[PDB]
Amino acid sequence: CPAERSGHVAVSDGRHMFVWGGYKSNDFYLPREELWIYNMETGRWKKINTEGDVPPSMSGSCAVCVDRVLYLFGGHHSRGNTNKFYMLDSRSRVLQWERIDCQGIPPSSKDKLGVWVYKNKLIFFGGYGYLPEDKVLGTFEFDETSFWNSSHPRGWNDHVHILDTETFTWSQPITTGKAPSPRAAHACATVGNRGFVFGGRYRDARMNDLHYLNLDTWEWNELIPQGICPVGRSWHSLTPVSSDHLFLFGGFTTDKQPLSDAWTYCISKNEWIQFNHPYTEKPRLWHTACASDEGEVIVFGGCANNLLVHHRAAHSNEILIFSVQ
């Protein structure tokens, strides 16, 4: 079984779930060369060692699986944040990582962000990291705590960047509407041409807001569901489960309460529906969640308590299976 961890990545093609990186206590990053594969249909794990341009071991990286080609951006290693971009073709032989020297201006070095996949584009939003090298489209807000306990200050951004896989070129779309505030540890989910984003941390709050960016027109929209909404949080997962539902699980509140609540956001109804499940005693923060082809949401890793208290952090290696559809 894979070692416990938080801040790893997990991506899938609906049947196989690829898990990489992250860190644990007793702190250290998990081995960079390992790639763990969970077969969603059988519940078994397989460890494969990779070669090539292996990325440094990181937490907070942002990854996707498109046609069984994995792509990884950003993260935080022993020497801080990065804006490097890697590809790992998993289709067919020893897997080889490829660090892509992209054209255009990359996003600033950062972690704890989100991404939407839409046709040939990978669209990245937000995150936490260094001051961008130059003034680009969007806003950056420093985290005042980063100036006293560090040699290099950091902050949040609301930046939207496209990595076009036709040419491996970075760009920023000109957006209309009001973008969500700069944030990190938010969660992104895509359904068709709508790139949803929920929650996240900004300044002294872990937020409860929900927006979508139209990935064809580049117009931002704020969603105002009526009635009861989930509590504000960061470090939660948001996973599309059908053409009309997003599944929300776990996270951490503004007042540092670990969460075990689950909800479905019904897009057509613009309404949140609380989801009953057998894991109320299993809150998770910084876990990952992948949808299977069987309607399930497979949650892995993450921490059961306040991982900000590193010596008491309860990092997990459990798989929690939510039967959503």
């Binding site: 907070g60 705590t145 540890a185 991982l307 900000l308």
Partner: peptide, 7 residues
Amino acid sequence: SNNTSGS
């Protein structure tokens, strides 16, 4: 640690 900041 530096890895958990900003969350």
